[PDB]
Structure 1
Amino acid sequence: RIALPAPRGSGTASDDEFENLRIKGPNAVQLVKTTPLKPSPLPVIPDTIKEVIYDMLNALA
């Protein structure tokens, strides 16, 4: 997510007008923040990928 810099000054007529000039300005510094972690489930490994991984484990012996 592109970061939002703090509210520069309370007040909508003047401060938020120049806060849009700053944040949305052609020249700006779009720093990034990550989203909060979404609970990813483990991907089921395909059977062919398990006949690839198992053949190396057999090559250990």
Structure 2
Amino acid sequence: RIALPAPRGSGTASDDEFENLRIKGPNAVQLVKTTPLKPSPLPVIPDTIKEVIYDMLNALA
């Protein structure tokens, strides 16, 4: 998500007018923040990927 810089000044006529000028300006500093972590479940490993991983473990022995 592109970061939001703090509300510069309360007041819509002037401060928010120049806050859109700043944040949305052609020349601006679009800093990034991450979203909060979404609960990813583990992907099930395909059987062929397990006949690749197991063949290396057998090469240990």
**TM-score, normalization by structure 2:** 0.99
Percent identity (aligned)? 100
Deviation sequence 1:2-47 (CA, Å, 0-9, x none):
0000000000000000000000000000000000000000000000
Q: Which runs of 5+ in 1 are unaligned?
A: none
Whole-Å Cα distance in 2 between the matches of residues 32 and 19 of structure 1? Answer: 18
Whole-Å Cα distance in 2 between the matches of residues 29 and 22 of structure 1? Answer: 9
Q: Which runs of 4+ in 1 moved over 2 A?
A: none
Q: CA deviation at 1:56?
A: 0.2
Structure 2 SS opposite 1:55? helix
CA RMSD, 1 decimal: 0.2
Q: Which runs of 5+ in 2 are unaligned?
A: none
**TM-score, normalization by structure 1:** 0.99
